Write a protein that binds this ligand. Structure first.
Ligand code: L2V
Lengths: 971, 265
């Protein structure tokens, strides 16, 4: 689709005078080259006297996606034109030259044309595009306010920790508060690499590090840099705080730093141009005065897509849902024959009109009931929808409304879908429902602060209940809440402020069906003490839809959530960007401020949003989000257009390799990819671009000597890219990456995020369970990038390259020396980590081919994309692993080394169970993501079972001991 | 007499998880209820779950020195005595906001009558037959869903190409209108060959768009028709899943372990 919708290409140019000329032009010819020759050729026609000046002419044609784009960018070749039909119209240029060039970079980076966003006339989208430029301007001003240094902070942000304080176990690995490091100063234009060795403390800042280095060479214009990648140390932080240095000490290796002059870095950074776009220039009474009852009329359904013979009667099932909880009983319209869907019935609800909360959010459905067989009639949903009862401008909906109904998602059994996004199906081949709302002779507006505040305070220091209040706040969010606790919490709500962590539990105790208690709760939430960022993320879930609760949660995030924590929780924070109901929320104005301040966050903000545009439910919401980000991202639009183009030639390469060559064997496929990747079109695209998995790594000349189709499951691609950095021999010699096409990487990406979180919990607490969470990234629909972990072998393969003693003897083979006793240790502290983690998350079966071992004895899994499914213990220490752990002793179960392996697993399981609230919050935000094994709150109930959260601390361990003993057959 | 054994009562379901009881009270009449052992797994709790107002409530039954009740006055002696008192008297005395009493108890004896062939000889064989039917139907539905997704991508792709052909016609028609204005200077007194080619190209493009319009119409019908088959298969998959799990739930209490089910599934 990139080139055309041929050995000889003929374009039928259309001159303004109307000379339809058909001429042949080369594909490599640019737009300017064909423009110059066409005018010379057009002069032979009898109507050549009417031609005007050449410079006042431009090309206009049709793109693949039907966008009539204008070709101001004469630099682009014919292949890059993305023409639909071979033809070319010449008209005088109109509009602004710079604005349309930017509109083409944004259109290509997003994947859809930007001109499509200006067709929609909905007030919700239009006033979002115009009013989202306050944050975009504010962010751009902030990063340009200070010296050129502030420009560098955006481009090369620090990769730092959340805590300067080193853990006790880590701090003992460096002696007397001092660590050694090597500096690789380059002093001459000719490559003269010299290394200086110096002793630095764990508290010194890079300014002090620079001062010591200059002394060792025998005001500063020099800044540090990680050798082998584009990471810089230009922030006034302790040197031990940086993530690279922490990794170097904890893996026990040599940190290598290089010296770069500041002026060399600043000249690399270009200027920024935020041109203000074109669209930037361009009787009511309160709701509480109404005393009627909510009545809604379902006129008819235009189309329904179920069989007449199989399905007898259909009906419409509705309900008013305040973010998951029903505000009243669901109402059924009377059943009608499938041939003629037509109800015209005034549905009546129990909700008093002033009782309505802000996020009323009526939910619809169209079920089908047969009743021929079975006592319980089988209601099978046919469609679903959602309608906000209050517009974005605090106005109750009125008058007839037409809604388009989505199809029911796969693997969903509920008649309604309260989790679905409020809106209408853009497609015009879906069931359409006609609604009518009551009209109160005026526009109904939700009350302001004054009306709500005056409702409160108008209607109208303990002994032992503090213990119960503390006990309530320490339970799981999904724990058993009883009607006696909810009564107890609400009666003692004024003493709940002294325990700020109890807010998520107290909001569950409020009844939104009444405006008396809702008004009284708004007073408390107004002056609630701030809570921890890991607990304020709980309020951003689906269960809390109120604007004040979600507004309060962001207010805590803006002050508490840091840059490194934000990067960890970026997948979830994007996922709670669909549970919001209005486009002009507070989360977007908070997420975009960070994405326009950190290029490291901005790199993943783009890719996380870009991957979810395949779904049509959030294609428009995220399209407007990326268009505003891409416009104000800066000069990163040129880098983000290199990766999108590079990752599109790969998709086309794999797609024709999957379908057209499925019958072909690997031998022909190997020679087929050799020819296809040989073409200069792929050579230019797949070279010299930043890696999507890490903005710091650069992918040099794609090395073709070892770049072959992996002979594995879904024919992946194993691609080698050299390291173009000057000092590359210290970090990476070739950045290997596996391009998985046709496999869902969203489940794997979430699994590795939990594994990253778990390892932080163990290391911080005091354990030293070392595991390998590698890099994963989903880019589009069923397409992902997987980072290769360098030297490694599957244990299935390791038994042929070297009987149960094969794994131990192989480890003892390439570990000769004193280091052998440390290779088994690392094989133990990594075995224990992946046994607790797999058991808790319930990852799928673990063969001897999903298990990877490094030359140093480290162990890690190729995490399957099927978690919480296989109660079940996936990883059991086989007879191969038990020999290595017990130092080769035949009495594996009773040795001291295996005893220390059990007490290592027990301390790990107890540590995670103490931080079980964090893992429950993370799993509860990906409900609307669409993973088949995580779509409802009953799926997270598996986590609460394997962690034994219901039982006590001592009852939980005997649940773990028995569960492992069912396969290990011995303690 | 007024206090029977909880074991023989129909509403008391024993020990079931919260997720296993939400399905029982799913889309049910308001006022239905059942009593289950508390999730915390002590002795004598017997939390009561009730469906009122469209959502599932929970009520804990306190127990101290051999009595039972909701609040601290533990007047009622046994659990069966307490429930039978609130079936004939609304819960409004306990709480003004709780109105509907325990109208329709969820019973396990009726579900026992639902199961055929209590003898073990037929339970084992019938489970295999139902699982084979369920697995075959599930494979059929997964094939239809994959096909239905594929046709969704084709009509979306074909629809966009229709939009492009509409715009190309507009550009060519707009270019033709310029010729009508520009040909006035010549007709009042080559051009004829040029005009014929432009008319020929537009006519062919009109046919090309029309063929695309017809092809989309045929593809749209297949997209709709298969969506009818997919919607009809699902209810049958629903009924088979209930009965297959019912036999497995009845068979799993004969002394087998979960590891057998994991390997079998
Ligand atoms: C499936 C079993 N059977 C095989 O034959 C295996 C055996 C074999 C040999 C050497 C390395 C490996 C590996 C690996 C690997 C490394 C890191 C990974 N992180 C994440 C996910 N998964 C990973 C997989 C496997 N071989 C391959 O899968 C294979 C295919 C193409 C290759 N092409 C090149 C250029 C190289 C260097 N190695 C390749 C390895």
């Amino acid at each position: 689709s990139g080139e055309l919708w041929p050995p000889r290409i003929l374009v039928e140019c259309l001159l303004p005078n109307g000379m339809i000329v058909t001429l042949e032009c080369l594909r490599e010819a640019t737009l300017i080259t064909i423009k110059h020759e066409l005018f010379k050729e057009a002069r032979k026609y009898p109507l050549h006297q009417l031609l005007q000046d050449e410079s006042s002419y431009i090309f206009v044609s049709v793109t693949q996606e039907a966008e009539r784009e204008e070709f101001f960018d004469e630099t682009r070749r014919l292949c890059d034109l993305r023409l639909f039909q071979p033809f070319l119209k010449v008209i005088e240029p109109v509009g602004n030259r710079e604005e349309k060039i930017l509109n083409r970079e944004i259109g290509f980076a997003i994947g859809m044309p930007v001109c499509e966003f200006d067709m929609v006339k909905d007030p919700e989208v239009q006033d979002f595009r115009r009013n989202i430029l306050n944050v975009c301007k504010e962010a751009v001003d902030l990063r340009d306010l200070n010296s050129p240094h502030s420009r560098a902070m955006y481009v090369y942000p620090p990769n730092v920790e959340s805590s300067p304080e080193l853990p006790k176990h880590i701090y003992n690995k460096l002696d007397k508060g001092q660590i050694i490091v090597v500096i690789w100063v380059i002093v001459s234009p000719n490559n003269d690499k010299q290394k200086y060795t110096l002793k630095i403390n764990h508290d010194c800042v890079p300014e002090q590090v620079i001062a010591e280095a200059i002394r060792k060479k025998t005001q500063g214009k020099y800044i540090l840099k990680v050798c082998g990648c584009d990471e810089y140390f230009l922030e006034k932080y302790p040197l031990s705080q940086y993530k690279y240095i922490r990794s170097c000490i904890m893996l026990g290796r040599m940190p290598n730093l290089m010296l770069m002059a500041k002026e060399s870095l600043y000249s690399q950074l270009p200027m920024d141009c935020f041109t203000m776009p074109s669209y930037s220039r361009r009787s009511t009474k309160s709701l509480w005065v109404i005393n009627s009852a909510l009545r809604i009329k379902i006129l008819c359904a235009t189309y329904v897509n179920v069989n007449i013979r199989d399905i007898d009667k259909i009906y419409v099932r509705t309900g008013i849902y305040h973010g998951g909880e029903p505000l009243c009983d669901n109402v059924n319209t009377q059943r009608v024959p499938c041939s003629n869907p037509r109800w015209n019935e005034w549905l009546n609800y129990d909700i008093y009109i002033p009782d309505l909360p802000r996020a009323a959010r009526l939910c619809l459905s169209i079920c089908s009931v047969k009743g021929r067989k079975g006592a319980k009639e089988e209601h099978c949903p046919l469609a679903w929808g959602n309608i906000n009862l209050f517009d974005y401008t605090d106005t109750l909906v009125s008058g007839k409304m037409a809604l388009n109904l989505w199809p029911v998602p796969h693997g969903l059994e509920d008649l309604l879908n309260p989790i679905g996004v409020t809106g209408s199906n853009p497609n015009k081949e879906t069931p359409c429902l006609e609604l009518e709302f009551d009209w109160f002779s005026s526009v109904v507006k939700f009350p302001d602060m004054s009306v709500i505040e005056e409702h409160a305070n108008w209607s109208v220091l303990r002994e032992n209940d503090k213990e119960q209040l503390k006990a309530i706040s320490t339970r799981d969010p999904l724990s058993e809440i009883t009607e006696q606790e909810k009564d107890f919490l609400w009666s003692h709500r004024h003493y709940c402020v002294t325990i700020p962590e109890i807010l998520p539990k107290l909001l569950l105790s409020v009844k939104w069906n009444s405006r008396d208690e809702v008004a009284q709760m708004y007073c408390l939430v107004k002056d609630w003490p701030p809570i921890k960022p890991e607990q304020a993320m709980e309020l951003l879930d689906c269960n809390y839809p109120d604007p004040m609760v979600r507004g309060f949660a962001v207010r805590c995030l803006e002050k508490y959530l840091t840059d490194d924590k934000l990067s960890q929780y970026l997948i979830q924070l994007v996922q709670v960007l669909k549970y919001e109901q209005y486009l002009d929320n507070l989360l977007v104005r908070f997420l975009l401020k960070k994405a326009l301040t950190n290029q490291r966050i901005g790199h993943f903000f783009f890719w996380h949003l870009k991957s979810e545009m395949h779904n049509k439910t959030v294609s428009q919401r995220f399209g407007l989000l990326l268009e505003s980000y891409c416009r104000a991202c800066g000069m990163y639009l040129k880098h983000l257009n290199r990766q999108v183009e590079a990752m599109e030639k790969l998709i086309n390469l794999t797609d024709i390799l999957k379908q057209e060559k499925k019958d072909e064997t690997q031998k022909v496929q190997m020679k087929f990819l050799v020819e296809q990747m040989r073409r200069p079109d792929f050579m230019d695209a797949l070279q010299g671009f930043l890696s999507p998995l890490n903005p710091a790594h650069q992918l040099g000349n794609l090395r073709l000597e070892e770049c072959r189709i992996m002979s594995s499951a879904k024919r992946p691609l194993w691609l080698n890219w050299e390291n173009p950095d000057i000092m590359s021999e210290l970090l990476f010699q070739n950045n290997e990456i596996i391009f998985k096409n046709g496999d869902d990487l969203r489940q794997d990406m979430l699994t590795l995020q939990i594994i990253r979180i778990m390892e932080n919990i163990w290391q911080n607490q005091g354990l030293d369970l070392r595991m390998l969470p590698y890099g994963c990234l989903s880019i589009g629909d069923c397409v992902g990038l997987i980072e290769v972990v360098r030297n490694s072998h599957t244990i299935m393969q390791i038994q042929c390259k070297g009987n149960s003693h094969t794994l131990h003897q192989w480890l003892k083979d390439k570990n000769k020396g004193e280091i052998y006793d440390a290779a088994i240790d690392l094989f133990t502290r990594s075995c224990a980590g992946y046994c607790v983690a797999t058991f808790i998350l319930g990852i799928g079966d673990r063969h001897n081919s999903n298990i990877m071992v490094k030359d140093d004895g480290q162990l890690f899994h190729i995490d399957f994309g099927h978690f919480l499914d296989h109660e079940r213990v996936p990883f059991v220490l086989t007879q191969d692993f038990l020999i290595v752990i017990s130092k080769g002793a035949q009495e594996c179960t009773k040795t001291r080394e295996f005893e220390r392996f059990q007490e290592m697993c027990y301390k790990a399981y107890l540590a995670i169970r103490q931080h079980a609230n964090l893992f429950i919050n993370l799993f509860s935000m990906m409900l609307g993501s669409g993973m088949p094994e995580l779509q409802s709150f009953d799926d997270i109930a598996y986590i609460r079972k394997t962690l034994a959260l219901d039982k006590t601390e001592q009852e939980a361990l005997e649940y773990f001991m028995k569960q492992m003993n069912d396969a290990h057959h011995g303690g | 007499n007024n206090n029977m054994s909880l074991q023989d009562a129909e509403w008391y379901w024993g020990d079931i998880s919260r997720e296993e009881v939400n399905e029982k009270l799913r889309d049910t009449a308001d006022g239905t209820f059942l009593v289950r052992d508390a999730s915390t797994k002590m002795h004598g709790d017997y939390t009561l779950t009730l469906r009122k107002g469209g959502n599932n409530k929970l009520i804990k039954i306190f127990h101290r020195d051999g009595k039972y009740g909701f609040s601290d006055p533990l007047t009622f002696s046994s659990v069966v005595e307490l429930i039978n008192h609130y079936r004939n008297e609304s819960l409004a005395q306990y709480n003004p906001k709780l109105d509907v009493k325990l109208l329709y108890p969820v019973s396990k004896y009726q579900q026992d009558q639902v199961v055929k062939e209590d003898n073990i000889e037929a339970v084992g064989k019938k489970l295999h037959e139902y699982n084979t039917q369920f697995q075959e139907k599930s494979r059929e539905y997964d094939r239809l869903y994959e096909e239905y997704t594929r046709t969704s991508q084709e009509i979306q792709m074909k629809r966009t190409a229709i939009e492009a052909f509409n715009e190309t016609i507009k550009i060519f028609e707009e270019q033709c209108q310029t010729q009508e204005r520009y040909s006035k200077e010549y007709i009042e007194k080559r051009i004829m060959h040029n005009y014929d080619k432009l008319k020929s190209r537009i006519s062919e493009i009109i046919d090309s768009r029309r063929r695309l319009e017809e092809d989309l119409k045929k593809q749209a019908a297949e997209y709709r028709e298969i969506d009818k088959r997919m919607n009809s298969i699902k209810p049958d998959l629903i009924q088979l899943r209930k009965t297959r799990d019912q036999y497995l739930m009845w068979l799993t209490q004969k002394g087998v372990r979960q590891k057998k089910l994991n390997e079998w599934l």
